[PDB]
Amino acid sequence: VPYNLGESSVDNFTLGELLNLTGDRDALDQLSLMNNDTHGSLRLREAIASLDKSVSPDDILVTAGTTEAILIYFKVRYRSGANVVVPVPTFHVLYETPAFLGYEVRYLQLRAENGFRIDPQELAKLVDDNTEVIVLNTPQNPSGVVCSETEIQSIIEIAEKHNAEILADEHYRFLPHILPSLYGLSPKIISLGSTGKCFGCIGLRIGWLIGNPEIIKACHFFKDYTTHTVCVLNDYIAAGVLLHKGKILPRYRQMIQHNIQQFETFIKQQRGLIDWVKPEAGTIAFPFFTDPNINSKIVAKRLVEDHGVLLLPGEAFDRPSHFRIALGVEPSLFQYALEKLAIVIET
Amino acid sequence: RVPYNLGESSVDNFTLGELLNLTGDRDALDQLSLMNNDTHGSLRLREAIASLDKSVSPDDILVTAGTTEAILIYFKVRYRSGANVVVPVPTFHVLYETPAFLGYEVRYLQLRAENGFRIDPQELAKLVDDNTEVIVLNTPQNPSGVVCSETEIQSIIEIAEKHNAEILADEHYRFLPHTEILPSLYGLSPKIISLGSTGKCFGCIGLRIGWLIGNPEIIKACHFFKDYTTHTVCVLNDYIAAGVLLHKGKILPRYRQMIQHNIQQFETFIKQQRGLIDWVKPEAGTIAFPFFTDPNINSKIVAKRLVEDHGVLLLPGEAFDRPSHFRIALGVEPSLFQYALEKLAIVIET
Ligand SMILES: [Mg+2]
Ligand SMILES: [Mg+2]
Ligand SMILES: [Mg+2]
C-alpha cells in the first residue's frame, strides 16, 4: 500500500543514501566474506558500547536482529516449570517465543486508562521464584510510553527479590520525543538494542544483547544453532550508522514531532472521538476510539481498501478500540492518512 | 585466527570487492531499499535458486540466514513428542545437535571408512521406525566428501516412504563436483526437503544465505516460524547471493581447479607417506577426511603440534569421533595446501 502507517520502523534509507551519511562505502569492498567475529565485529561492539558508560565491548553479543537475541536468551534461561512475565500490549515475539520454548507466560495487562504504565503491586502479584524473566519493553511498542525511574526501580526490586532477570527491550531508546540504557542499573538486567527501527535500516538485520559474561557465553554458544554469525557487511554498515547517529536521528526526531503535533490537531478535530496516551519515545503511537462500540478492524479495513492507507488495528494487540500508527513517516503521508481517516470516521 | 587455517569447510573466501568484480552487482547495491526484504527471499534470488533444477520452482524456496537457520526451523516445525531423527555420522554437528536441543531422540548411523563412508540400506532400515520423522541425508558429505550413489538414494527413499519419514537433504556442496553442479535431490521423491547455500562453495560463507526447498505446506510452516528466528534476511546479502548464483560460471571453475590440484597434491602426499596416510577419496565438495593407518598416533596431538610449530590448522577427527582421521580443506590455494602437507610430514617424521 502506498500509505503504510502500520509498521514500527521509520522510513528506510536506500543503501546508497545510508553510505552517503556514514562514509563507509569505500571500506566495504575490502571487507572479507569469511565468517564475522562470532560476537560481532569489534567496530560494531565498540560503537554499541560507546552509547553507555555501563557497557563495555565485551558485554555485547551481536545477533541477526533482536528477534534472534530474544530467541537465544529465552532458550538459555529456560528450565522446566519456569514462567515469564510479559507486559502486554507489546511486540508479539516477546511472549510468543517464550511460549514456543515451553515457558508459562504470565501477562501483565497494560491499559490506556492507566497510561499503559506498570503498577508495581500488580507485577509483584505475577512474579514468583519460578519467574525467570520479566520482560521490560521501554520505550513501549505500540504505546510509546517510557517507564519512569521509579517504575524501573520498583521492577528492579521485585526482580532482585525473586532472582528474576529483566529483559529490557530498548529498541526505541534512540528516538526520545538518546535514552540511557538500563544495563547498568541492576545485575539482573539484560538489555536488547538494535539499529533497525530507529535509523531507517530495519533490513540490515542487526541487533544486540548486553549481559554479564555468563549469559553472553551461554547465548554465544546457542547462537551456533540459529544463524552462527551475522554478515560482516551488515555488521560494518550498522556500526557506521551508530557512529554517525547525529546525521540520522535528529532528522527522524523532527519528523516524529511534526507527526505528533499533526495527530494532536487531529485529536482536537475529532472532538473526543479519538484519544491517546501521548507517546514519550519511539516510532509509534497507540491511539484509540473513545467509543466502546466502534471496532478499529472495520475502520482500518475501509481505510486501506478505499484509500490505500494502512493502520495496524488494535486486535493485533488484543485492544480492539486501539490502532497503531507509524510516526516516522514523511509528515505529508501522515497528514494524508489522517485526512482519509477523518473521511472514514465521518461516514 | 591462525593464518594457515585448513580446518574449515568453506573455500577461500573473497573480499566483497573481489566478489562484486565477478558478479557485476556493485552499482545496483546503492539503489536497494533497506526496508524489510521479501520474507521468502527476493524473487531474484529464488528464481536464481530455482533455475538450478527443473524440479524446483521459485515458490518452493524459503531463503534463510544460512542453512543453520533452515535446519532449526525445519526440525522445529516437524517436531512432536516421541519423534526420532536418523542422522548418519560423522556429519555437520548442527544436523544432529539441533534436533537434540529440540527434544528429538537422535539415532546415529555410524558412517565408516572401511565401508567408504557409504550408507548401508540394511543398517538404515534397522534405525528407522514409525516414530522416525526425519532422515538426514548430507550429500556431498561433510567431512568425507562422499556422494551418495543412485542406488543408495533410492534405498533411503524406500525406507523413508515405507515409514513416512521425511528426508532432509543437505546439498550444501552440490556446487563442487570433482557436470557443472550435482543435481538436486528435491524432485526425486515427495518426502525430500532440500537445503542449499552459496556459502561453502562460492567463497562467501559470511553472507549468511541459505535456503530450504520443500512442498508448499512445509514452506508455509517454516516461513511462519522464521518470524521467531530472524524474520527476514538482509536485502543486500539476498541481492549479492543471487548474483553469485547467476554468475556461478565466473566463480566455481577457479575453486574446482584449486580442489583438484590439491586432491592431486594429497595423492602425491599419500604415496610419499608409503601407507601411513590413507583416505576415502572425496567425490565432491570442499573437504577431505584422510586418516592415519597407524592405530597408535592420535590425530589431535598431531594437529596440536602442527598448529603450534607451523601455524597450520587441521581439524582433528575427534571433532567427529574419528580419532585416526583429520579434516583438511581442499578449497585453499594449492601453494598453501602444499605448505601444509610439507609441514604435516615434518610433524609426522618426529
Ligand atoms: Mg561504554
Ligand atoms: Mg527462579
Ligand atoms: Mg527450476
Author numbering:
A (entry chain A): 18 to 194, 200 to 369
B (entry chain B): 17 to 194, 198 to 369
Original paper wording:
The ncAA l-enduracididine is an early intermediate in guanitoxin biosynthesis and is produced by GntC, a unique pyridoxal-5′-phosphate (PLP)-dependent enzyme. GntC catalyzes a cyclodehydration from a stereoselectively γ-hydroxylated l-arginine precursor via a reaction that functionally and mechanistically diverges from previously established actinobacterial cyclic arginine ncAA pathways. GntC initially facilitates the reversible deprotonations of the α- and β-positions of its substrate before catalyzing an irreversible diastereoselective dehydration and subsequent intramolecular cyclization. Consistent with many type I/II PLP-dependent enzymes, the GntC active site is found at the homodimer interface.
GntC crystallized as a dimer of homodimers and adopted a largely α-helical structural fold. PLP was bound to K219 in each monomer as an internal aldimine; this was consistent with sequence alignment results that suggested this lysine was responsible for anchoring the cofactor in the active site. PLP-bound and PLP-1 GntC structures were highly similar (0.31 Å root-mean-square deviation (RMSD) for backbone atom overlap) with the major structural difference being an additional N-terminal ordered helix that helps form the active site in the PLP-1-bound complex. When comparing PLP-bound and PLP-1 internal and external aldimine substrates, there was a 30° downward rotation of the pyridine ring, orienting the amino acid substrate toward a new ordered N-terminal helix that was not present in the first structure. The comparison of holo- and substrate-bound GntC structures and activity assays on site-specific mutants further identified amino acid residues that contribute to the overall catalytic mechanism.
